[PDB]
Amino acid sequence: VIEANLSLNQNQLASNGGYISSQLGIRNESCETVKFKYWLSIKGPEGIYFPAKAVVGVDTAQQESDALTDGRMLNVTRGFWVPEYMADGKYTVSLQVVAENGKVFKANQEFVKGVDLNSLPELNGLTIDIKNQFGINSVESTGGFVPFTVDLNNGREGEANVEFWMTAVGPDGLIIPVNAREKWVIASGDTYSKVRGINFDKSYPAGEYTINAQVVDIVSGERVEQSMTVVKK
Amino acid sequence: PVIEANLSLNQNQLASNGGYISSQLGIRNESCETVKFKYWLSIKGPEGIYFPAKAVVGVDTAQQESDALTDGRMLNVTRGFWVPEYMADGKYTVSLQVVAENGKVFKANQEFVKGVDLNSLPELNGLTIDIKNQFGINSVESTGGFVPFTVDLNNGREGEANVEFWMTAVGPDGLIIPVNAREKWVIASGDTYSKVRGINFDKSYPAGEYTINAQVVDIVSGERVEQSMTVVKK
Description:
The structure is a homodimer. Chain A is 0% helix and 62% strand. The first copy, chain A, has strands at 2-8, 12-13, 18-28, 34-43, 49-51, 65-68, 73-82, 89-99, 104-113, 122-123, 126-132, 138-139, 144-154, 160-169, 175-186, 191-200, 207-217, 222-232. In chain A, the strands form four sheets. In chain A, strands 2, 4, 5, 6, 8 and 9 form a six-stranded mixed beta sheet that branches. In chain A, strands 12-18-17-14-15 form a five-stranded mixed beta sheet, with no helix packed on it. A four-stranded antiparallel beta sheet of chain A has the order 10-11-13-16, with no helix packed on it. Chain A is globular, with a radius of gyration of 20 Å. It is classed as structural protein.
């Protein structure tokens, strides 16, 4: 058994990006020595994925393992630049460890670029509040149901013409529909409110599902994404 | 293979203003007994876009209902979807997906493009990105394997290009595995930056589908372009 810990020196960048320093902690909490591989990666808006390592010449390194003995622990510091060209929005930093026996351990932290950390995602005046209703992060292999709350609040002076949908992006290349495409013309000060659930049928493959919601202002053409995780065991 | 899935699109090339795509879905039971399944049509696009083929007038309240085909029987239906102008130009994959009652997953995919040429390399305004699975290796053994990728960025501009480049493998269990560290190159006019980079799939890595994801950025214009390939670890 391994314990992975991740800490970011800062969690909010202005629109022109900046530097983020990470404190990586990998602890072996067992009597036996453990062999493993680890790395640090970033997920972001608009399909951005990138490695935390950046090189001055040509990348030619391999992925090397590590070993920790009884109660022993690894501690490293790694930083990375988030450049201005990257989309404003929410990013997830992921410290990932795969032990020799196939066990996966992950420690994540979020940072934002160009938006307030403690504000709802937003399209001008239109706030987007989409949540895993009861904080259910996994379901049994024999199946389970997970409800999500959806609240699109139009804080604008004018009406908002929006499109909304959700999928579940999972194992084996699956993209399961969770919410069909809906269109709503929402008056100033009004709200689109709704609860939507997905039934994870017993037949669906085990692994990680990213419940991915999308909201578009079809007049401005701007799009906002909200991603949430559910594991089927 | 107990189920055979087929997908056809009525057109594969849209202009930047988007348009409407009609499709034929075929699901055939190749076996001699009844098969129960669920199926749907979904789209994957540039800039992290994913959307279902289905659109509704009001509130969507339905659930994915099951279907069944007796021995030798087949289901044929049609689905259509609008590709709005606001969606990013680039490559899209339409996917017919079937999950049988026993967990078996069958897929049939087709591609369309929006606002770019159908048979042309991905491009950043004169700089072409040619990234390929070198030996057409689509899967590796559970005990491990290695897959090399060729990388070629041709600069057909009049001036020099400043690019940033990297690669990850996006896989099962939320893994995002570094394949190529972030590099910055200056490529002169008429030049081609050429490289080969592979990923070792260690034995310990989880079984399933890995999307090898390459990204290229014109660090002057800020424009980004992606190239995706699939390797399956058995």
